[PDB]
Each structure stands twice: as C-alpha cells, then as structure tokens.
Design a protein around this ligand. Structure first.
Ligand SMILES: *[C@@H]1O[C@H](CO)[C@@H](O[C@@H]2O[C@H](CO)[C@@H](O)[C@H](O)[C@H]2NC(C)=O)[C@H](O)[C@H]1NC(C)=O
Ligand SMILES: *[C@@H]1O[C@H](CO)[C@@H](O[C@@H]2O[C@H](CO)[C@@H](O)[C@H](O)[C@H]2NC(C)=O)[C@H](O)[C@H]1NC(C)=O
Ligand SMILES: *[C@@H]1O[C@H](CO)[C@@H](O[C@@H]2O[C@H](CO)[C@@H](O)[C@H](O)[C@H]2NC(C)=O)[C@H](O)[C@H]1NC(C)=O
Ligand SMILES: *[C@@H]1O[C@H](CO)[C@@H](O[C@@H]2O[C@H](CO)[C@@H](O)[C@H](O)[C@H]2NC(C)=O)[C@H](O)[C@H]1NC(C)=O
Ligand SMILES: *[C@@H]1O[C@H](CO)[C@@H](O)[C@H](O)[C@H]1NC(C)=O
Ligand SMILES: *[C@@H]1O[C@H](CO)[C@@H](O)[C@H](O)[C@H]1NC(C)=O
Ligand SMILES: *[C@@H]1O[C@H](CO)[C@@H](O)[C@H](O)[C@H]1NC(C)=O
Ligand SMILES: *[C@@H]1O[C@H](CO)[C@@H](O)[C@H](O)[C@H]1NC(C)=O
Lengths: 232, 83, 324
C-alpha cells in the first residue's frame, strides 16, 4: 500500500466516477428496488381494481344493490358479493405476507452484509462482491439499501517456474509464507496474491525433515543473513 | 411469437425454428453464439439485431453461449502470480 | 495422525417450473364457463402472474447458484495431480454429455400431468449446460486454486493449492510435503468409498427425491380435484351443460367454479411457500458455492464436518450435490 498510495487513491476516485456515470446512465441498473416497488404497487392495484367485479351478484356498486333490492333478498345478494370480496382480500393478504417473508429474508441478508462488509472485513469470497473484499459504503435508497463494495482484484499476471520447496543441506525448506518461484536462474519467494522479490533466507522459510521424501523439490541455495554480519 | 408444445406444424392450421420448448415464428437462427438477453427455453434464447444489408431489423434466436471459453494452461511446476 | 473423509451434502436449487392456464384448467373450454370466470374478475390473471413469477424465480435461482464464474473453463487433458485421481468427477467424453461418473451414479437414483392446462414449462438451463458449468467450476477449483473466483484464473500446482488449504486450516504444509503419496491414497480410498455408497444406497439422496415427490403429489392432487363436485350435482361440466338450463345451470356452475378456483388458489399458495423455501435453500447453496467451492471457509461445520479442505460440485435433477 505505501508503495502505491497515490495510485490506489487515483484508481479509487476513477472508480467513484465510473459508479456515478453507470448509475446516471440507465434506470435498470438499479433493478431490485424497482422490482419490489412495482410488485407491491401492482398487487395493490389489482386489489383495488377487483372492486369493479360483480362476482355473480346484481352489480358491483354496493349502494346500487342497496337501492335496488329489499333486505330479504339483498341478504343473499350482498352475501355473494361480500364473500367474493372477502376471498379476494384474503388471497391478497396471503400473498402480501409471502412477499413480507421474502423481504424479511432479504433484510436479514442485508444485515449480515452490513455487519460484515462494513463493520469489519469478511474474507468470504464473493459474499461482499466480486474478488477479495476490502470494505463497503452503505447508502440509502427509497425503501432499500445499496452497497459500494471496494474490492481487490488481480489485474496483470506473469507465470513463473516454481517449486514446492528447496533443500540446502538435504533438510527441506518450506516458506513461512511464500511461493518459491524463479524469474530466471535466481529463485524468489513471494506471497500468493502479489509479486515481491525476496532473496531466500532463513526468515522467509523454516527448515524441517529432509528432501528425499517430498515431491518436485529442486536443488537451490539458501542464503543466510548471519554470515555477512559475523564476517567482521 | 413462442409456442410450447405444438410441434409447429399446427401453427397455420414464416420462419420456423423448433427447440425443446416448441418453435418460434419469425425467428432468425444464428449458429454464432452470444451471451443473451431474454431467456426462451432449453437454453435457446432470443434478442434483436439491427442489420444493414437485408432486413435491417430482425429478431435472432440462438443457443446460449455459456461464456468465453478459456483454457488455463496448467502444469506441475508452472505458477502464475499477479504483478 | 488424521484422515480425509469426503462427504456428500445435497441441496435443491429449483422445483419444476409448473405453469397453469386458467381458462382450460378451471373451465372445460366452454363459453358460459369462460363468461362466468371473467365475471369473477381478475383472479385468473393474478394466478398466471404468480406462476410466471415463480418460474422467473427458479430461473434466477439456478443462474445465481451455478454461473458464478464468467468464463467457461476447460480441464487440461493431462492428469498429473500429484497422485490425486479425479476421474470420477472430471468430465468424460464417451458419456452422452460431458458429464462425470458421479452424476451418472446420481441420475439413476432420482424419480397424468398434462392435457389439463398444467404445462410443465421447460427449464431454462438444460442438463448439458448445467454439467458444463459444473465442469468449469471443477476445473477452476482444481487448476486455479481459490483465485479464479476472485478475478482471472491463475496457473497453480495442485500440491500448492492443497498445501495452502492446510496452512489456512492451521496444519503446516510440512505435513503435506512429507505425506503427498499417502494423502493421495487417502483421497482415492475416500472417493472409492463414497462412490460405492452412492452406487448402493439412495436413502442418503432424500432431499431432492422428497422435494420432487412433494411437488408431484401436490400437482397430482390439484389434477384429482377436478373429479370432485364441490357441492355441485355433476363432476364433468359438460354433463351439467347436457340438460340443465341456464336458470339453474348458472348457479350450479357458479358453485362448481368457485370450488375449483378455491382448489387452484390453495395449490398456488402451496407452490408459493414451497418455492420460497427452495429459494432460501438456493441462496444457502449459492453462499456455499462462494464460501468454500471457490475457496475454503475457516468457519467450522458449515460446509464440512471438521476442518474443511475443499469441495467439488456436481449437478443432479433439479439439485446440486457437494463433495466436501
Ligand atoms: C528477475 O527479477 C530479478 C529482480 O531483481 C532480477 O534481478 C536479479 O536479482 C538477483 C538476486 O538474486 C541477482 O543475483 C541478479 O544479478 C539480478 N539480475 C540483474 C541485476 O540483472 C533478475 O535479473 C530477473 N531475471 C530475469 C531473467 O529477468
Ligand atoms: C540435488 O543434489 C543431490 C546431490 O547429492 C542429488 O542427489 C544425487 O543425485 C544423483 C543423480 O543426479 C544420484 O545418482 C545420487 O545417488 C544422489 N545422491 C544423493 C545423496 O541424493 C539430487 O539428485 C539433486 N536434485 C536435483 C533436483 O537436482
Ligand atoms: C494414519 O491413518 C491412516 C488411515 O486412518 C493410515 O492409512 C492407512 O495405511 C495403511 C498402511 O498399512 C493402508 O493399508 C490403508 O489403506 C491406509 N488407509 C486407511 C483408511 O487405512 C496411516 O497408515 C496412519 N498412519 C500414518 C502415519 O499416516
Ligand atoms: C482413476 O480411477 C479410475 C477408476 O478405475 C481409472 O479409470 C480406469 O482405470 C482402469 C485401471 O484402474 C483402467 O484400466 C481403465 O482404462 C480406466 N478407465 C478410464 C475411463 O479412465 C483411472 O485410470 C484412474 N486414473 C488415475 C490417474 O489413477
Ligand atoms: C505463460 O503463459 C503464456 C500464455 O499466457 C504461455 O504462452 C507461456 O508458455 C507460459 N509460460 C510459462 C513459463 O508458464
Ligand atoms: C413432430 O411430429 C413427428 C411425427 O412424425 C415426430 O416424429 C417429431 O419428433 C415431432 N417433433 C419435431 C419434428 O420437432
Ligand atoms: C448452422 O449449423 C448447421 C449445422 O449443420 C448448418 O446446417 C447451418 O447451415 C448453419 N447455419 C449458419 C447460419 O451457420
Ligand atoms: C513436470 O513438468 C515438466 C515441465 O515443467 C514436464 O516436462 C514433466 O513431464 C512434468 N512431470 C510430472 C511428473 O508432472
């Protein structure tokens, strides 16, 4: 990071800009919230529209039926109309509760994503977003939340000839954390998710056993830092 | 128009293309795959193409490419490290 | 001393995208019946809308749980995986599709419904391309470590991948480096044992069989409800049409149609809850597909009994299985 602070900031701000443009370009990029709002309002619209149906009764205007017929027959007529409206309202309520449970599950998922991608850093790949995750910036939205996930993604890779381990005195050498790779004839040890040259020394690697039993090991030098200092 | 279980001979009683989901009427089949837009069925998936020579507007219906097929070159002692 | 104990965990991802065409199911393609059904109003449109919503949900479930990787990968033909034999899980050419013997064992251990307006809408992703996705995921988790899920794939030796998984767990890579042959033998023995278990007992594959059976019984009962009269005096609507006249036929068909529509309402509600449960399990499956299929989860007993090492996905009828 301290090797590339300005570059990190530049990429960050360019990413902010591309987010601005991507959001302001097309409406359907923000789709989930529109889906939920449209589904709710359209279900309610169907509910209110259902009142126009006579359901087999004399008409749909209840006051018209009140004016037309007498109570001894308005009894059965309104009975039919009310049972129809009751059935429609009941199925509306059941579907509303279904979508309420779905939204509740989505809200719990959002709570987890907020408590992990924001209140910490969740190592779980492809939970916060594509690639490794760094942080996330919550933002409000009308009946919904949106996350600006900041991710680390490898961009340019160079393949190298590598080795499972090395042995200097027969005893095998296994990296404390690194990969034994060789740019050319010179071997190097580096962390998995970046390239970093490192002369093989005792700090980068512990020593155990002997290299007869391991597989794919290569003969390579293991320099030491104590010798040059003790030389004087 | 998409039909489900007609075997497509019964449509009139234009261009017809039959999939495991029935046939389309007025559909240009394209062997050249594409990551598609509007799922139809059995992987067959449709979209709209603006041409320039004949029928400058048309509807294509193609097999759905599952992605840009890439073959990693694995080897026992060949590692790739991002720089 | 330790062991590697492969285990199968089975999760459904989608039910059958059953649809309904109200005008022909509720109504025996009659004119008076159609008039009455429209007289009840906009129920039928609401029902068809709910069913097509469920179908879209199944589509999204499958696409989100499987196609987490953009590029479809190709397994290199050579197999020099430090002694690990992936023949049972890697794709095989001579099979009818680019499947593997594990799902070939799975397929056979999985288990009237038309002409009544119950159209089984075809699944969007056919079996061949689902197997292609599984092949790509397997290739990514073999030859690219956990990296290919994050960004672009990286050539990684398999011994390196397994050693890094060990180091993540807490056991140091010295153990693998000193035991590679024994570890490969252990995994081969475990895969043979699980192959035998899957080839002998299907009682473990209960989840998918049970969900498919539940859906089949629900649809079968839905169809069988037509025979019932619901208080009406004749089962078939045509028999009512035969001699009963509109003054009485209107009320008779009203009773019959309200009964049939109530039955269809019960069926669609049941499908709604079952689809919601399946989608919840499918989000669980996708989160598994992300947490340790494309990596390994330091959390315990989520995707493996014990310190988890890796996972291999495999397709199955309407479901997925994980070899943890
Ligand atoms: C690979 O990268 C290294 C990074 O410095 C290059 O530098 C060599 O580093 C080793 C250290 O063990 C020295 O012994 C060499 O003399 C360095 N090479 C120089 C200065 O030219 C190395 O050269 C690169 N190799 C190839 C083949 O490109
Ligand atoms: C690393 O050097 C050792 C030196 O002993 C090599 O071991 C010898 O290898 C030769 C063949 O090259 C055998 O004939 C000897 O019997 C081996 N002796 C011992 C004591 O091991 C070893 O092969 C070298 N390894 C690599 C990868 O270069
Ligand atoms: C540790 O346990 C494993 C199994 O739990 C042992 O592996 C067995 O080794 C014998 C050798 O006599 C083989 O015949 C078996 O096939 C191996 N597997 C099983 C499941 O028995 C291993 O020997 C034990 N010891 C060490 C040091 O790993
Ligand atoms: C992995 O195991 C499978 C299962 O046996 C092997 O497949 C067959 O193996 C026998 C001998 O064990 C051969 O005679 C057959 O020709 C193999 N058939 C196929 C289709 O491969 C497979 O060879 C094993 N692979 C490794 C690398 O051990
Ligand atoms: C590195 O990858 C390129 C293709 O990206 C390939 O042509 C080359 O042979 C590879 N070299 C090594 C040493 O892996
Ligand atoms: C259409 O019907 C024919 C009847 O001979 C049948 O063989 C065929 O499989 C059906 N489907 C087609 C042609 O797609
Ligand atoms: C598509 O492939 C089929 C396979 O034989 C071939 O007959 C047809 O001509 C091809 N069409 C185009 C437009 O490539
Ligand atoms: C190991 O890789 C080298 C290429 O670097 C190849 O020539 C050799 O055949 C491979 N051997 C094994 C056992 O994988």
């Amino acid at each position: 990071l301290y090797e590339n602070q300005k570059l990190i900031a530049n990429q960050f701000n360019s990413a902010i800009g591309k987010i601005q443009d991507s959001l302001s370009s097309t409406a359907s990029a923000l789709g989930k919230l529109q889906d939920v709002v449209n589904q709710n309002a359209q279900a309610l619209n169907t509910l209110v529209k259902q009142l126009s149906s006579n359901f087999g009764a004399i008409s749909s205007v209840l006051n018209d039926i009140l004016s037309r017929l007498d109570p001894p027959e308005a009894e059965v007529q309104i009975d039919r109309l009310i049972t129809g409206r009751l059935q429609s309202l009941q199925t509306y309520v059941t579907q509303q509760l279904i979508r309420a449970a779905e939204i509740r599950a989505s809200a719990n998922l959002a709570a987890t994503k907020m408590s992990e991608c924001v209140l910490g850093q969740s190592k779980r790949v492809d939970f916060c977003g594509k690639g490794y995750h760094l942080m996330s910036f919550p933002q409000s939205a009308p009946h919904g939340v949106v996350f600006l996930h900041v991710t680390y993604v490898p961009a340019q890779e160079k393949n190298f000839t590598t080795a499972p381990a090395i042995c200097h005195d027969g005893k095998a050498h296994f990296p404390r954390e690194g990969v034994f790779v060789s740019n050319g004839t010179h071997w190097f040890v580096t962390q998995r998710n970046f390239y970093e040259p490192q002369i093989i020394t005792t700090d980068n690697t512990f020593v155990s056993g002997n290299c007869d039993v391991v597989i794919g090991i290569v003969n390579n030098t293991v320099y030491d830092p104590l010798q040059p200092e003790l030389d004087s | 128009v998409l039909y489900q279980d007609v075997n497509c001979t019964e449509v009139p009683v234009s261009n017809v293309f039959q999939t495991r989901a029935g046939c389309l009427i007025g559909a240009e089949h394209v062997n050249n795959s594409y990551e598609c837009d509007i799922p139809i069925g059995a992987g067959i998936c449709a979209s709209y193409q603006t041409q320039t020579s004949v029928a400058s507007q048309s509807i294509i219906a193609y097999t759905m490419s599952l992605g840009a097929e890439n073959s990693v070159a694995y080897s026992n002692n060949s590692i790739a490290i991002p720089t | 001393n330790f062991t590697i104990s492969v285990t199968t965990e089975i999760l459904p991802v989608s039910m059958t995208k059953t649809s309904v065409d109200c005008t022909m199911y509720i109504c025996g393609d009659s004119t008076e019946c159609s008039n009455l059904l429209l007289q009840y109003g906009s129920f039928c449109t609401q029902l068809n809308r709910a069913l097509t919503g469920i179908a879209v949900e199944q589509d999204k479930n499958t696409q989100e749980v499987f196609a987490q990787v953009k590029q479809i990968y190709k397994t290199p033909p050579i197999k020099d995986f430090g002694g690990f034999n992936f023949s049972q899980i890697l794709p095989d050419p001579s099979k009818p599709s680019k499947r593997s013997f594990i799902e070939d064992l799975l397929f056979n251990k999985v288990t009237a419904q038309k002409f009544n307006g119950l159209t089984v809408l075809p699944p969007l992703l056919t079996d061949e391309m689902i197997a292609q996705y599984t092949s790509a995921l397997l290739a990514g988790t073999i030859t690219s470590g956990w990296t290919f899920g994050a960004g672009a794939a990286l050539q990684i030796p398999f011994a390196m991948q397994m050693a890094y998984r060990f180091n993540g767990i807490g056991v140091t890579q010295n153990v693998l480096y000193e035991n590679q042959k024994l570890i490969a033998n252990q995994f081969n023995s475990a895969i043979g044992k699980i192959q035998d278990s899957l080839s002998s007992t299907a009682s473990a594959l209960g989840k998918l069989q049970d969900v498919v059976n539940q859906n089949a019984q629900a649809l079968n009962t839905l169809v069988k409800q037509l025979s019932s009269n619901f208080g009406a005096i004749s089962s078939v609507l045509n028999d009512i049409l035969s001699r009963l006249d509109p003054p009485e036929a209107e009320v008779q068909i009203d009773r019959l149609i309200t009964g049939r529509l109530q039955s269809l309402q019960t069926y669609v509600t049941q499908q709604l809850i079952r689809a919601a449960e399946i989608r919840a399990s499918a989000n669980l499956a996708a989160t598994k597909m992300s947490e340790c299929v494309l990596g390994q989860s330091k959390r315990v007993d989520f995707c493996g009994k014990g310190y988890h090492l890796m996972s291999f996905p495999q397709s199955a009828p309407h479901g997925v299985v994980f070899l943890h």
